[PDB]
């Protein structure tokens, strides 16, 4: 691969420079190369990996939604170009899921990293589900559910209810229930119990941890008040 001759630390440094330059495709490529060195990512490095690919697929998803809307309102050109963007989006999701399965998801991790990566797996299957149809959609939806559910089980056993990774997982799994799985009641129940259980334990947190936790709690509440 094009990053194979570069030092791991140089890849991480360049990922950070790419972030400053808002060059997220480059950032993702550097982080992919870093993952391929075969060492476990630190907390900071996991966040770099996630931010990079979030921004890449985010732009693709937004473009796909524009083109799909134009196509729905409506020669083969709109469909062709929507399909082009869709295929590139699916390619990025496949890349991320490949990194997770081949390098990052392990049995013998700390809870923080195991939950982080299984949540990510659920997210990227969810992005595939956004553009899938038919029975193919059904299997992709179940793959997302299974990854989220495993992450949930670990997070409830090994993390406190205020842990920001646990909270972000619950937020995205609830969004999965509402937007993908046609289960708004489950979405609302999960957001509510997650919010309430975190609320009850805020008194244990420092000022800094309190800010981290309450910022994600506020996102949960935003979705709850949108939905109800």
């Amino acid at each position: 691969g094009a990053m194979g001759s570069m030092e791991r630390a140089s890849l991480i440094q360049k990922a950070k420079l790419a972030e400053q330059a808002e060059r997220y495709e480059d950032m993702a490529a550097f982080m992919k190369g870093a993952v391929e060195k075969g060492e476990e990512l630190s907390c900071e490095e996991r966040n770099l990996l996630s931010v990079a690919y979030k921004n890449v697929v985010g732009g693709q998803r937004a473009a796909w939604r524009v083109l799909s809307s134009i196509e729905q309102k409506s020669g083969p050109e709109v469909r062709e170009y929507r399909e082009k963007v869709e295929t590139e989006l699916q390619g990025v999701c496949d890349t991320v899921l490949g990194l997770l399965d081949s390098h990052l998801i392990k049995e013998a991790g700390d809870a923080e990293s195991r939950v982080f990566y299984l949540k990510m797996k659920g997210d990227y299957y969810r992005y595939l589900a956004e553009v899938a149809t038919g029975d193919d959609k059904k299997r992709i939806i179940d793959s997302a559910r299974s990854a989220y559910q495993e992450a949930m089980d670990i997070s409830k056993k090994e993390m406190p209810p205020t842990n920001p990774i646990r909270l972000g997982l619950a937020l995205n799994f609830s969004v999965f229930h509402y937007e993908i799985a046609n289960s708004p009641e489950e979405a609302i129940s999960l957001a509510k119990t997650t919010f309430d259980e975190a609320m009850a334990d805020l008194h244990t947190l420092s000022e800094d941890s309190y800010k981290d936790s309450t910022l994600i709690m506020q996102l949960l509440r935003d979705n709850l008040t949108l939905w109800t």
Partner: peptide, 7 residues
Amino acid sequence: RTPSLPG
């Protein structure tokens, strides 16, 4: 769509 985690 409903918003997901922004990070």
